[PDB]
Amino acid sequence: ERPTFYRQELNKTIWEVPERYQNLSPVGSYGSVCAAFDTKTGLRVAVKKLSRPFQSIIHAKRTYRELRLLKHMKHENVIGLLDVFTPARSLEEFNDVYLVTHLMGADLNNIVKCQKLTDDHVQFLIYQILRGLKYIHSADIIHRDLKPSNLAVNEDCELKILDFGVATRWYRAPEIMLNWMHYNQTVDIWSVGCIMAELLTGRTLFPGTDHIDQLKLILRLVGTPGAELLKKISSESARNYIQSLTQMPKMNFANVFIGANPLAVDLLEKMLVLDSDKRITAAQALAHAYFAQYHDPDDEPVADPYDQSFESRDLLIDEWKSLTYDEVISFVPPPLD
Ligand SMILES: Nc1ccc2c(NC3CC3)nc(-c3ccccc3)nc2c1
Ligand SMILES: O=c1c2ccccc2ncn1-c1ccccc1
Structure with missing residues (x-):
């Protein structure tokens, strides 16, 4: 099922995204963000590559938190998750997180x-x-x-x-x-x-x-x-x-x-x-x-209830990493209209 990725260097960073997303163009700088064209829907999107998402406990938990939050939001006046992906093929390989949202003007x-x-x-x-x-x-x-x-x-x-x-x-x-x-x-x-x-x-x-x-x-x-x-x-x-x-x-x-x-x-x-x-x-x-x-x-x-019991947990870097990995895997793209 895994799509084909392509590599490029945007400014001071490597980007490795699916072929689905094209014409990457920097827009600002937690991580940096590119404007892209999304071939699946024909919309303009923002792709955010997180910076060193798992270098520390604090980063690891923050990465998990933002992913959990974005995956939860389903409302017209709140940013939501169009896609999330990594170039990694396995948990052991897992190091980069990219988040995809609508691009607002x-x-x-x-x-x-x-x-x-x-x-x-x-x-x-x-x-x-x-x-x-x-x-x-x-x-x-x-x-x-x-x-x-x-x-x-x-x-x-x-x-x-x-x-x-x-x-x-x-x-x-x-x-x-x-x-x-x-x-x-x-x-x-x-x-x-x-x-x-x-x-x-x-x-x-x-x-x-x-x-x-x-x-x-x-x-x-x-x-x-x-x-x-x-x-x-x-x-x-x-x-x-x-x-x-x-x-x-x-x-x-x-x-x-x-x-x-x-x-x-x-x-x-x-x-x-x-x-x-x-x-x-x-x-x-x-x-x-x-x-x-x-x-x-x-x-x-x-909104539906949101489980933030994780907020009071003290876990190892690798444990927050694996929890984030789980959330990438279970992501269901939002209905296409
Ligand atoms: N029920 C409440 C309502 C308002 C409060 C308030 N308001 C501050 C004037 C802005 N400040 C504080 C508080 C407690 C400890 C340290 C510093 C501030 N508590 C409040 C408890
Ligand atoms: O980070 C941005 C962003 C930055 C500059 C201009 C537009 C933008 N649009 C969306 N996002 C964004 C992307 C992914 C997760 C949270 C927010």
Whole structure:
């Protein structure tokens, strides 16, 4: 059954892919990525060759994790696995992992950094993010690093979230900035709020220079923690940090986001709540007035359960390697339409 591979050297790396994929062309650089043409479907695809996937425990488990995650995602607004393959003929030979996904035109970083989107474009793009997040979250997966560059958009404005499971810090929830161990799914909602803000204004909402500055900018908009939040904070030094700060009052968002659709201001108030317990969830946000023209309760599907019990396991390099090998072998290509 094994297909015929061909070798080439793309830039500073060897590539060995099936004949199925042609006209490889570098597009960027966890591993490096080529644009290719896929002869089986006639679509443009991205092929990512992982860098040294099994050189350490950490790499080996990370390779396994990303493969497991990609194999699980089956939703219109989340990147999924078109193919995965290795040039190796046996487990003992197994050393290279390549992943195949649809090639999307651009990332949100691009569409925002060149220009300022209209309100109906913001609605549609934020809607799609929330729709993919609902799905991701229903599986008990947290993305943790949502940001414009992890959001792929084609020329049709269809959006797909990538990399689940321009400074990263600018989109992070303040509980992460403060290193809380038990933060949950709404760290992603925070990030969406920051992105949505940025799409409406054309400017990074919280462009901190570091973790302290990042917090300062955040508290300045959302205000310093109240007593109700403060009494939920287990860490003494953390509690003493924020409590030693200059008591900033919550800003009225309608005055910071002057002239924006007030339904958007209101959704932003609900996403950018300091206390993560009170922050709107993805499911709830979808039913918000602001998404009136897109929301459909019958077409916002949830995911199948995802087994992440592996995350708490300590295994040898060779054991994670063999588990990854198993997943390459059992891969069933997605239905062709
Ligand atoms: N139920 C909760 C709700 C919010 C929390 C929060 N929020 C930080 C203001 C952003 N921070 C922390 C925490 C715990 C230990 C060390 C550092 C931070 N815990 C929280 C527990
Ligand atoms: O890594 C990319 C990628 C990088 C730059 C431009 C477009 C891209 N499209 C898809 N992927 C990708 C490929 C495989 C697994 C996860 C993401």
